[PDB]
Amino acid sequence: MKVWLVGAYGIVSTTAMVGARAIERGIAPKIGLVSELPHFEGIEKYAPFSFEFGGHEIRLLSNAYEAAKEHWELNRHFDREILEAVKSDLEGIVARKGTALNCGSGIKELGDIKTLEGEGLSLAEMVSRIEEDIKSFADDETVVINVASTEPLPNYSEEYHGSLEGFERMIDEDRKEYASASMLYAYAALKLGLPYANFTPSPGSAIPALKELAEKKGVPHAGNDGKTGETLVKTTLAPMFAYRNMEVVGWMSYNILGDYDGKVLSARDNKESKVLSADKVLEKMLGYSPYSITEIQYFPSLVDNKTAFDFVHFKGFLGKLMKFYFIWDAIDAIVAAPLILDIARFLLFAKKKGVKGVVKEMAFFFKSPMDTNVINTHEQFVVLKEWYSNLK
Amino acid sequence: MKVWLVGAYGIVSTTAMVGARAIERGIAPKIGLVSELPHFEGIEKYAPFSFEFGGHEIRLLSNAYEAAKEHWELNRHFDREILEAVKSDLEGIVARKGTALNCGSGIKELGDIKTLEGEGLSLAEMVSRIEEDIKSFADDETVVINVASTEPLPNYSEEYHGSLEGFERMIDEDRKEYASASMLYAYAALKLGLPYANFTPSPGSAIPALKELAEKKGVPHAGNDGKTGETLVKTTLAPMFAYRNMEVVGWMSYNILGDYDGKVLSARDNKESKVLSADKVLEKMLGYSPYSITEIQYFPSLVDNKTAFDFVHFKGFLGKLMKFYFIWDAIDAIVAAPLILDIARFLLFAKKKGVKGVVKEMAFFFKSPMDTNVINTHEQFVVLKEWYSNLK
Amino acid sequence: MKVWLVGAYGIVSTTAMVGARAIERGIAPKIGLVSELPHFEGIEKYAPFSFEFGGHEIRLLSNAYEAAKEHWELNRHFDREILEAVKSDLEGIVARKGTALNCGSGIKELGDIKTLEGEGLSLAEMVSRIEEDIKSFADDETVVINVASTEPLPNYSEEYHGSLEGFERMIDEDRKEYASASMLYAYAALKLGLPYANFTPSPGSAIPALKELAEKKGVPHAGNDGKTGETLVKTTLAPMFAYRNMEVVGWMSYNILGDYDGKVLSARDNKESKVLSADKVLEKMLGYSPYSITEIQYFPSLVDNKTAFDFVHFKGFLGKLMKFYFIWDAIDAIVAAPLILDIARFLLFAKKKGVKGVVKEMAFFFKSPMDTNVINTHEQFVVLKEWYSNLK
Amino acid sequence: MKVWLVGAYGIVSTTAMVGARAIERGIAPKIGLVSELPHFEGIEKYAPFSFEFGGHEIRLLSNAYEAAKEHWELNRHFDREILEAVKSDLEGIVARKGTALNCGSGIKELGDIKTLEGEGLSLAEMVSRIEEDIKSFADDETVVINVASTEPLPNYSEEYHGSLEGFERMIDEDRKEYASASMLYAYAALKLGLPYANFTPSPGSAIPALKELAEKKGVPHAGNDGKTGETLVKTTLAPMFAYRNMEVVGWMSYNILGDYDGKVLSARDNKESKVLSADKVLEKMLGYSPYSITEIQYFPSLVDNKTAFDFVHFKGFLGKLMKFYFIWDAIDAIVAAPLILDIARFLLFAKKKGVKGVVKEMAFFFKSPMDTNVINTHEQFVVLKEWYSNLK
Ligand SMILES: NC(=O)c1ccc[n+]([C@@H]2O[C@H](COP(=O)([O-])OP(=O)(O)OC[C@H]3O[C@@H](n4cnc5c(N)ncnc54)[C@H](O)[C@@H]3O)[C@@H](O)[C@H]2O)c1
Ligand SMILES: NC(=O)c1ccc[n+]([C@@H]2O[C@H](COP(=O)([O-])OP(=O)(O)OC[C@H]3O[C@@H](n4cnc5c(N)ncnc54)[C@H](O)[C@@H]3O)[C@@H](O)[C@H]2O)c1
Ligand SMILES: NC(=O)c1ccc[n+]([C@@H]2O[C@H](COP(=O)([O-])OP(=O)(O)OC[C@H]3O[C@@H](n4cnc5c(N)ncnc54)[C@H](O)[C@@H]3O)[C@@H](O)[C@H]2O)c1
Ligand SMILES: NC(=O)c1ccc[n+]([C@@H]2O[C@H](COP(=O)([O-])OP(=O)(O)OC[C@H]3O[C@@H](n4cnc5c(N)ncnc54)[C@H](O)[C@@H]3O)[C@@H](O)[C@H]2O)c1
Ligand code: NA
Ligand code: NA
């Protein structure tokens, strides 16, 4: 299959790519890959473990190996022997210039960039560029996945976001103020008939205009926001207090990371997307609102080794308060990369089984799952096993 | 309803008793009580929230208030106002002398004791004493719950444990070597037709002889070993790594507590019951065996504020290792006491709905659930909701 | 001795007062009191353990017992038996209306207040009120200690802060914009010849104008900002990495607390004082600057049980990075209250031994110690033992 | 200078050796090296940073590179580029067969071994072998350092350990029962006039017989037991509670590690040396005894990444209890290796300045410092700076 990755030179994207090749060549195991769990035995009928890559970027690099090597040099998150072994393959992956339209002050932190809007292009002329890039690449086993830096909350609009005719009136009118890059790549993927998933908390396809598009076109789509680390523990651990009839009175989450993702999210406007996609979640599981703080702070020595500290204060019998603490030390790109591969495969599956519109049943992968109030990791894994069973 | 509690002067038992009265008088909330969750709306038809208490003890105290006050003085785990309010009621709860038969070197740590075997009695004469105590107390809404100190592994016997005729040949023969106190109270409860649960990891009713008894007599029973704190997190958190196709390569659990339970478990022979009821659990959820250490150490300053430190080391994508830590700070008797009340109510329910034999469906409450390989807290809560739905 | 406490109805102040009486009546031990360590044997010649209290407040309460009881009700940070025992004594402690001048947006969080400036008074007329309150109270064994909510950074001024003639030209001119409440109480204490310490990070006496005053008047003074919890660990633990020739590359401190102090510091302008009095400290011990973040977030369930989470990332041999974590769970008022008593006693001592100006040698008590680059807790404890030895 | 290392193929030893060469070739920094702190400017007059290595081993390997590579393969605790760069130099380091005499059941865990006693040799004939190995190597700038696996407590003897004439009567008599390998290498180093340090908690030179020897021969010696990680925090952090007049009521230390050191210490008899060299330390700083547990458990996934979890429970004002937690994640060989280099250099220094007998002033490096009750890391660093100042 083919996968077009927006943000193709990022750490998640490049580590998905390193990983795919390394497993393909049989020099790495298949751990971390949900689509390789036994209950999904049979998936390789529809989405075999075979990948070719392309994508959009705004940072300047020769190819995807150079990009992979840049993150590796800092993180050493896979062996030098893997890098060497996948070099050749990754050198032939060359991203295309995308659009950083309304992608926040955070984008400054990425250094050297070049974008389509900086060429002067109108919305319609950018859309055309994006679609040309993908369609030239795409086939009938192609999926577009967004793994680009998180954008701030978009400029509000019922007219331009509320319907597909309204969204297309935006492009027609060249009303840049209401378009964000991630809306345009999602728009482009769906107009071309390709499945789309958003691994970031940027709006993407989560606006009505694009939900309506995906359905008309009969195209499956999923998101938003990969649930990979702290929030996975949170949606796995919060249920417990509910099952035991306890009140969570406060829950603190503090995350520190560096590298590009930590840099970008170091901006106030970009940060806001991720902190509000991480605060309403307790309520969806407990039905009420504990005092819940969630913070991201930049901390450069850690690079992609995002580390989180949470503290859960909770009432139990007689209303006596008690305490729980945890700490997560993992590299974000390792928890994230095989999920891109699973999501893709599950997308191809769903496309082949005639699925269209939000694949709500893929909530298991995401912090802000579209078109569903099922947040509890256990309930989401069941919904996912049962979804796939019904369609196999 | 009535509840006969073995170890009636313990902290769990006395805090169940304080709590029951305090809620009865409407001066405490119903938090921590699973039987009060909305899905169990309707239970109060069969097991209303109304309790009268009795039990067996070996430590010497005037009544259950004096006992409650002793633990309170050290722990202050509920308000002074509650204690005062429940005093009168608890002063009229007077335990009966039980049996510490083959209950380990740990029993020394409890100080002043007196037991039936120390009167010289044979097995048959002790059995008679125990049954006389309970039957005089019991009615048709009576349940017997074991909350006594944890016993070591019992002396092995196919003949005497393997069948009810064989177990009764033990009593007949006065073969003390093969009987443990907790087998005799379980034997007595079931011979009298009362439901029984074991909140401790001592054998209790978990031997074939007594499983066969409960069935013949048409009596429901549940256990073993209340899952209240660290192990609840463990069976709630371990699934996550499985759902995400990760390998847990090692898992460390270290617990420190004091007070009587920490004292008794400070012995090598008594400790062994609890550490082996806490080590095989990962396998039942993951299907393989991480390196898993589980320790209990005495630490007197903590009293009943058992605190646990766990560390989970796990492989993910490409086999990169990563780390998770947690720490649990809670008072054991607060996490444990409403469960005694739930278990009782669920026992009365099950009795009334004609249930007999192991109530496997109550696995949710226990670390060593009898007659079931369902350990995952999520799966156990579902099995419990569905059990009760089918019978309501 | 007498102690006038600014913020006399706060938790620190009231718990110093509860504690002093409880020890006086011999119903509490002398733990937490540095002035009671054996190397300070002999201090009771100059500052016996005997206290009478007064102070300034802006929150409305009948007396210091009602105030003590308010914090106790929420925190239960000492026994009910102590409260009862010290009631009478504390009921006869009645604060006087002070001034909240330029004390930040945070002051809103304290609810019901009344202040001198709200009566309309000029600077000179407020100064007069403050001095009248204290002088009526004071004797020759009186010390004034500031334990009031933290103020934001004051409005900058060389003219009005730079000299005593300049500061007094401020009062004369009624230039409120450049005066903060804590400058006026410090000004008043020193004009009356009383020793002063600042337990908060508000400017207090730490401006040149007031340093010059204290010297002229021959009056000892100390500050700023009680080092009681996290920062005590930080100045005790940071040296270690230096002694071992390691580079600290990043150090994260995150604090969560509630109650009034957490409320007030919940404001952006008030928070700023405490976060900049907690960030430059590493450099003073290591001589360079690790990436250091320090945050305070409001978290109401904790009340005065401020809890902190720090993470220290550091290079060692060959430049390999390694990790250290800690967590502090303590009630702030317990760590803070005996220090008020020590500081006072050490102030009276110093006054009697003819000491004047900044008592740099009391750095051991403070996060921002005036007139000294000695931050390392070990070095500060030595400087303090040696100071007192030289004067005894 | 030359350094003879007992246990020359261990991770500490080989990483000291990798490190020394890598710094020598100017491809690594001098971090972690206490002898390179500015207060020891001038040391390179007496002990320049220049090293040649030799040592005794019992595990079978071709040279010190193969040994270094074995630990590296598992731990990757320095770059591949360093290994390659130091290869040649390390290939020419070939250990000599030593003695595992009375070195515990733990020694089984090391796999393939060969030892002098297994050749049949008497004590006198082994001593001769050991001395021949070292003397052939030694010069006038040679030091012998013990970095071999920890031995159990030795078989008790006043006669044979109590005096040098008595110890030599042991060798003479061939009374193996009372000799441990580490006593014989220490005996040999000192008879040859070489300085000796013990980086392990095995007796070494810490018996009177060998203390008397070192003095007669005018030879400096130091130990025991490198204080590198958890215990360094403990002797840095414990003072704080004392300075603040608090009572530590309990202190828990739990360590988990793997690799050879964790394997060997996995034995009950070997473990005992390290747990009793880690329990009496609090008293030497606080003057009383908190409840203190200290444990080591094997945990193979961690290899040399020893991780520790401590919990400190302590009374403060009014006797209110409060809590502190910490966790140490570091690789033991990184914290340990430059100390071998410092200790050596400080040994050569001391030898040249005519120092003889225990160098008590090197306590700073060790968990069980000989001939001194100075345990507090701050006080030990001062004693060390002042020692060196007095002699420079
Ligand atoms: N565990 C995780 O790594 C995790 C979890 C949840 C969500 N995410 C989201 O995944 C995304 C990528 O994560 P990462 O850690 O690889 O970050 P990264 O910054 O290294 O990668 C993002 C890449 O996208 C590029 N980019 C930014 N805006 C773009 C645009 N509008 N068009 C085309 N390219 C653009 C950047 O140049 C960069 O190369 C981030 O939004 C992150 O928040 C990551
Ligand atoms: N969260 C929890 O508190 C928790 C969790 C799981 C299991 N448990 C089990 O619950 C039991 C009670 O816990 P606790 O903390 O109240 O301990 P506890 O020691 O205070 O109470 C046990 C009581 O039983 C009595 N006893 C001991 N052996 C007896 C015998 N054979 N016959 C009659 N009485 C006997 C003791 O005297 C004591 O009063 C222990 O086995 C414990 O391991 C507790
Ligand atoms: N461990 C600690 O508790 C700790 C450590 C370092 C510094 N401090 C500082 O101590 C101070 C008091 O701490 P707390 O926890 O008791 O807080 P608190 O809010 O309960 O007490 C402060 C009291 O001062 C009063 N106040 C505020 N501004 C005033 C003004 N300008 N004039 C007169 N009264 C005023 C408030 O009404 C309140 O009653 C805070 O600044 C705090 O930041 C506390
Ligand atoms: N931070 C630390 O690494 C640390 C801290 C304090 C003490 N120590 C002590 O340092 C010693 C070495 O630590 P390591 O982690 O390198 O362990 P390691 O097991 O890898 O190295 C010890 C080496 O000594 C050899 N050996 C064992 N007994 C011997 C004998 N009697 N004669 C000659 N060789 C022998 C072993 O074969 C091995 O190669 C251990 O005692 C350890 O407890 C280490
Ligand atoms: Na870690
Ligand atoms: Na705690």
mmCIF file with all atom_site columns, N, CA, C and O in Angstrom, chain B residues 155-182:
data_model
loop_
_atom_site.group_PDB
_atom_site.id
_atom_site.type_symbol
_atom_site.label_atom_id
_atom_site.label_alt_id
_atom_site.label_comp_id
_atom_site.label_asym_id
_atom_site.label_entity_id
_atom_site.label_seq_id
_atom_site.pdbx_PDB_ins_code
_atom_site.Cartn_x
_atom_site.Cartn_y
_atom_site.Cartn_z
_atom_site.occupancy
_atom_site.B_iso_or_equiv
_atom_site.pdbx_formal_charge
_atom_site.auth_seq_id
_atom_site.auth_comp_id
_atom_site.auth_asym_id
_atom_site.auth_atom_id
_atom_site.pdbx_PDB_model_num
ATOM 1   N N  . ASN B 1 155 ? -0.801  -27.448 54.939 1.00 0.00 ? 155 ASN B N  1
ATOM 2   C CA . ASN B 1 155 ? -0.150  -28.757 54.747 1.00 0.00 ? 155 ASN B CA 1
ATOM 3   C C  . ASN B 1 155 ? -0.880  -29.571 53.693 1.00 0.00 ? 155 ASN B C  1
ATOM 4   O O  . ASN B 1 155 ? -2.090  -29.755 53.796 1.00 0.00 ? 155 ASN B O  1
ATOM 5   N N  . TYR B 1 156 ? -0.148  -30.018 52.670 1.00 0.00 ? 156 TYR B N  1
ATOM 6   C CA . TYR B 1 156 ? -0.742  -30.622 51.461 1.00 0.00 ? 156 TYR B CA 1
ATOM 7   C C  . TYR B 1 156 ? -1.485  -31.942 51.748 1.00 0.00 ? 156 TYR B C  1
ATOM 8   O O  . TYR B 1 156 ? -0.952  -32.795 52.465 1.00 0.00 ? 156 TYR B O  1
ATOM 9   N N  . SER B 1 157 ? -2.695  -32.105 51.190 1.00 0.00 ? 157 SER B N  1
ATOM 10  C CA . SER B 1 157 ? -3.413  -33.398 51.245 1.00 0.00 ? 157 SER B CA 1
ATOM 11  C C  . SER B 1 157 ? -4.524  -33.654 50.218 1.00 0.00 ? 157 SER B C  1
ATOM 12  O O  . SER B 1 157 ? -5.594  -33.066 50.285 1.00 0.00 ? 157 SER B O  1
ATOM 13  N N  . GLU B 1 158 ? -4.276  -34.570 49.291 1.00 0.00 ? 158 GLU B N  1
ATOM 14  C CA . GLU B 1 158 ? -5.327  -35.005 48.375 1.00 0.00 ? 158 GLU B CA 1
ATOM 15  C C  . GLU B 1 158 ? -6.489  -35.661 49.141 1.00 0.00 ? 158 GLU B C  1
ATOM 16  O O  . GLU B 1 158 ? -7.641  -35.284 48.933 1.00 0.00 ? 158 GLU B O  1
ATOM 17  N N  . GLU B 1 159 ? -6.194  -36.609 50.035 1.00 0.00 ? 159 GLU B N  1
ATOM 18  C CA . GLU B 1 159 ? -7.254  -37.327 50.760 1.00 0.00 ? 159 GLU B CA 1
ATOM 19  C C  . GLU B 1 159 ? -8.201  -36.426 51.525 1.00 0.00 ? 159 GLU B C  1
ATOM 20  O O  . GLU B 1 159 ? -9.397  -36.582 51.417 1.00 0.00 ? 159 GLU B O  1
ATOM 21  N N  . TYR B 1 160 ? -7.658  -35.501 52.307 1.00 0.00 ? 160 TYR B N  1
ATOM 22  C CA . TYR B 1 160 ? -8.458  -34.712 53.252 1.00 0.00 ? 160 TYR B CA 1
ATOM 23  C C  . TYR B 1 160 ? -9.033  -33.418 52.675 1.00 0.00 ? 160 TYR B C  1
ATOM 24  O O  . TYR B 1 160 ? -9.895  -32.787 53.292 1.00 0.00 ? 160 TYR B O  1
ATOM 25  N N  . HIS B 1 161 ? -8.544  -33.007 51.506 1.00 0.00 ? 161 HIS B N  1
ATOM 26  C CA . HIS B 1 161 ? -8.988  -31.746 50.910 1.00 0.00 ? 161 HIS B CA 1
ATOM 27  C C  . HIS B 1 161 ? -9.720  -31.993 49.604 1.00 0.00 ? 161 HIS B C  1
ATOM 28  O O  . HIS B 1 161 ? -10.454 -31.139 49.121 1.00 0.00 ? 161 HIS B O  1
ATOM 29  N N  . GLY B 1 162 ? -9.519  -33.200 49.081 1.00 0.00 ? 162 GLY B N  1
ATOM 30  C CA . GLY B 1 162 ? -9.951  -33.582 47.750 1.00 0.00 ? 162 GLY B CA 1
ATOM 31  C C  . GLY B 1 162 ? -11.421 -33.901 47.577 1.00 0.00 ? 162 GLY B C  1
ATOM 32  O O  . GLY B 1 162 ? -11.893 -33.914 46.436 1.00 0.00 ? 162 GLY B O  1
ATOM 33  N N  . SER B 1 163 ? -12.137 -34.173 48.674 1.00 0.00 ? 163 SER B N  1
ATOM 34  C CA . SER B 1 163 ? -13.571 -34.505 48.638 1.00 0.00 ? 163 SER B CA 1
ATOM 35  C C  . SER B 1 163 ? -14.187 -34.184 49.970 1.00 0.00 ? 163 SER B C  1
ATOM 36  O O  . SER B 1 163 ? -13.488 -34.135 50.976 1.00 0.00 ? 163 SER B O  1
ATOM 37  N N  . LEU B 1 164 ? -15.496 -33.990 49.981 1.00 0.00 ? 164 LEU B N  1
ATOM 38  C CA . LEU B 1 164 ? -16.202 -33.722 51.216 1.00 0.00 ? 164 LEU B CA 1
ATOM 39  C C  . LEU B 1 164 ? -16.201 -34.920 52.187 1.00 0.00 ? 164 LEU B C  1
ATOM 40  O O  . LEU B 1 164 ? -15.983 -34.730 53.372 1.00 0.00 ? 164 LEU B O  1
ATOM 41  N N  . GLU B 1 165 ? -16.430 -36.133 51.681 1.00 0.00 ? 165 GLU B N  1
ATOM 42  C CA . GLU B 1 165 ? -16.289 -37.377 52.460 1.00 0.00 ? 165 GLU B CA 1
ATOM 43  C C  . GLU B 1 165 ? -14.861 -37.451 53.067 1.00 0.00 ? 165 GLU B C  1
ATOM 44  O O  . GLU B 1 165 ? -14.697 -37.754 54.256 1.00 0.00 ? 165 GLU B O  1
ATOM 45  N N  . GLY B 1 166 ? -13.842 -37.163 52.248 1.00 0.00 ? 166 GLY B N  1
ATOM 46  C CA . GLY B 1 166 ? -12.441 -37.048 52.719 1.00 0.00 ? 166 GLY B CA 1
ATOM 47  C C  . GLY B 1 166 ? -12.143 -35.946 53.747 1.00 0.00 ? 166 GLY B C  1
ATOM 48  O O  . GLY B 1 166 ? -11.478 -36.195 54.756 1.00 0.00 ? 166 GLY B O  1
ATOM 49  N N  . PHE B 1 167 ? -12.602 -34.719 53.477 1.00 0.00 ? 167 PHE B N  1
ATOM 50  C CA . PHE B 1 167 ? -12.570 -33.652 54.477 1.00 0.00 ? 167 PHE B CA 1
ATOM 51  C C  . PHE B 1 167 ? -13.276 -34.049 55.775 1.00 0.00 ? 167 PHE B C  1
ATOM 52  O O  . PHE B 1 167 ? -12.746 -33.845 56.846 1.00 0.00 ? 167 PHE B O  1
ATOM 53  N N  . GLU B 1 168 ? -14.469 -34.619 55.694 1.00 0.00 ? 168 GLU B N  1
ATOM 54  C CA . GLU B 1 168 ? -15.180 -35.056 56.919 1.00 0.00 ? 168 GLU B CA 1
ATOM 55  C C  . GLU B 1 168 ? -14.534 -36.240 57.637 1.00 0.00 ? 168 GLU B C  1
ATOM 56  O O  . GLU B 1 168 ? -14.713 -36.422 58.839 1.00 0.00 ? 168 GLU B O  1
ATOM 57  N N  . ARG B 1 169 ? -13.779 -37.043 56.899 1.00 0.00 ? 169 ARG B N  1
ATOM 58  C CA . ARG B 1 169 ? -12.940 -38.070 57.507 1.00 0.00 ? 169 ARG B CA 1
ATOM 59  C C  . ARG B 1 169 ? -11.787 -37.442 58.306 1.00 0.00 ? 169 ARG B C  1
ATOM 60  O O  . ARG B 1 169 ? -11.349 -37.998 59.318 1.00 0.00 ? 169 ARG B O  1
ATOM 61  N N  . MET B 1 170 ? -11.344 -36.254 57.902 1.00 0.00 ? 170 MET B N  1
ATOM 62  C CA . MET B 1 170 ? -10.370 -35.483 58.678 1.00 0.00 ? 170 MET B CA 1
ATOM 63  C C  . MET B 1 170 ? -10.887 -35.062 60.051 1.00 0.00 ? 170 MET B C  1
ATOM 64  O O  . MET B 1 170 ? -10.167 -35.123 61.059 1.00 0.00 ? 170 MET B O  1
ATOM 65  N N  . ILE B 1 171 ? -12.135 -34.617 60.090 1.00 0.00 ? 171 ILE B N  1
ATOM 66  C CA . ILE B 1 171 ? -12.704 -34.057 61.308 1.00 0.00 ? 171 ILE B CA 1
ATOM 67  C C  . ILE B 1 171 ? -12.948 -35.238 62.219 1.00 0.00 ? 171 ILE B C  1
ATOM 68  O O  . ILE B 1 171 ? -12.460 -35.259 63.358 1.00 0.00 ? 171 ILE B O  1
ATOM 69  N N  . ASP B 1 172 ? -13.675 -36.223 61.688 1.00 0.00 ? 172 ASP B N  1
ATOM 70  C CA . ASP B 1 172 ? -13.851 -37.513 62.313 1.00 0.00 ? 172 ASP B CA 1
ATOM 71  C C  . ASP B 1 172 ? -12.574 -38.075 62.926 1.00 0.00 ? 172 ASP B C  1
ATOM 72  O O  . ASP B 1 172 ? -12.589 -38.488 64.073 1.00 0.00 ? 172 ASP B O  1
ATOM 73  N N  . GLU B 1 173 ? -11.488 -38.112 62.153 1.00 0.00 ? 173 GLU B N  1
ATOM 74  C CA . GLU B 1 173 ? -10.180 -38.632 62.629 1.00 0.00 ? 173 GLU B CA 1
ATOM 75  C C  . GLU B 1 173 ? -9.383  -37.715 63.542 1.00 0.00 ? 173 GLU B C  1
ATOM 76  O O  . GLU B 1 173 ? -8.375  -38.145 64.080 1.00 0.00 ? 173 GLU B O  1
ATOM 77  N N  . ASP B 1 174 ? -9.799  -36.453 63.681 1.00 0.00 ? 174 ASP B N  1
ATOM 78  C CA . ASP B 1 174 ? -9.087  -35.410 64.466 1.00 0.00 ? 174 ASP B CA 1
ATOM 79  C C  . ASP B 1 174 ? -7.688  -35.137 63.915 1.00 0.00 ? 174 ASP B C  1
ATOM 80  O O  . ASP B 1 174 ? -6.773  -34.893 64.699 1.00 0.00 ? 174 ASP B O  1
ATOM 81  N N  . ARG B 1 175 ? -7.529  -35.206 62.585 1.00 0.00 ? 175 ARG B N  1
ATOM 82  C CA . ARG B 1 175 ? -6.238  -34.969 61.905 1.00 0.00 ? 175 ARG B CA 1
ATOM 83  C C  . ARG B 1 175 ? -5.983  -33.476 61.744 1.00 0.00 ? 175 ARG B C  1
ATOM 84  O O  . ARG B 1 175 ? -6.043  -32.924 60.635 1.00 0.00 ? 175 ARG B O  1
ATOM 85  N N  . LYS B 1 176 ? -5.677  -32.834 62.869 1.00 0.00 ? 176 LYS B N  1
ATOM 86  C CA . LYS B 1 176 ? -5.396  -31.394 62.912 1.00 0.00 ? 176 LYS B CA 1
ATOM 87  C C  . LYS B 1 176 ? -4.347  -30.913 61.884 1.00 0.00 ? 176 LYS B C  1
ATOM 88  O O  . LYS B 1 176 ? -4.437  -29.796 61.369 1.00 0.00 ? 176 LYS B O  1
ATOM 89  N N  . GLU B 1 177 ? -3.377  -31.759 61.569 1.00 0.00 ? 177 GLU B N  1
ATOM 90  C CA . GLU B 1 177 ? -2.247  -31.363 60.748 1.00 0.00 ? 177 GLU B CA 1
ATOM 91  C C  . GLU B 1 177 ? -2.680  -30.820 59.397 1.00 0.00 ? 177 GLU B C  1
ATOM 92  O O  . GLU B 1 177 ? -1.988  -30.019 58.806 1.00 0.00 ? 177 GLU B O  1
ATOM 93  N N  . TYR B 1 178 ? -3.841  -31.258 58.926 1.00 0.00 ? 178 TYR B N  1
ATOM 94  C CA . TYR B 1 178 ? -4.338  -30.961 57.573 1.00 0.00 ? 178 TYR B CA 1
ATOM 95  C C  . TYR B 1 178 ? -5.470  -29.945 57.506 1.00 0.00 ? 178 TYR B C  1
ATOM 96  O O  . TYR B 1 178 ? -5.914  -29.596 56.411 1.00 0.00 ? 178 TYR B O  1
ATOM 97  N N  . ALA B 1 179 ? -5.921  -29.504 58.683 1.00 0.00 ? 179 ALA B N  1
ATOM 98  C CA . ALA B 1 179 ? -6.968  -28.481 58.825 1.00 0.00 ? 179 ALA B CA 1
ATOM 99  C C  . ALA B 1 179 ? -6.371  -27.116 59.124 1.00 0.00 ? 179 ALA B C  1
ATOM 100 O O  . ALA B 1 179 ? -5.413  -27.015 59.903 1.00 0.00 ? 179 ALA B O  1
ATOM 101 N N  . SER B 1 180 ? -6.897  -26.064 58.501 1.00 0.00 ? 180 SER B N  1
ATOM 102 C CA . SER B 1 180 ? -6.520  -24.707 58.896 1.00 0.00 ? 180 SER B CA 1
ATOM 103 C C  . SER B 1 180 ? -7.744  -24.000 59.378 1.00 0.00 ? 180 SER B C  1
ATOM 104 O O  . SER B 1 180 ? -8.839  -24.286 58.912 1.00 0.00 ? 180 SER B O  1
ATOM 105 N N  . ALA B 1 181 ? -7.586  -23.085 60.319 1.00 0.00 ? 181 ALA B N  1
ATOM 106 C CA . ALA B 1 181 ? -8.759  -22.376 60.855 1.00 0.00 ? 181 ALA B CA 1
ATOM 107 C C  . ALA B 1 181 ? -9.742  -21.941 59.758 1.00 0.00 ? 181 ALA B C  1
ATOM 108 O O  . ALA B 1 181 ? -10.961 -22.081 59.894 1.00 0.00 ? 181 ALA B O  1
ATOM 109 N N  . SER B 1 182 ? -9.231  -21.407 58.663 1.00 0.00 ? 182 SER B N  1
ATOM 110 C CA . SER B 1 182 ? -10.110 -20.785 57.671 1.00 0.00 ? 182 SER B CA 1
ATOM 111 C C  . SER B 1 182 ? -10.927 -21.832 56.926 1.00 0.00 ? 182 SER B C  1
ATOM 112 O O  . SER B 1 182 ? -12.007 -21.512 56.440 1.00 0.00 ? 182 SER B O  1
#
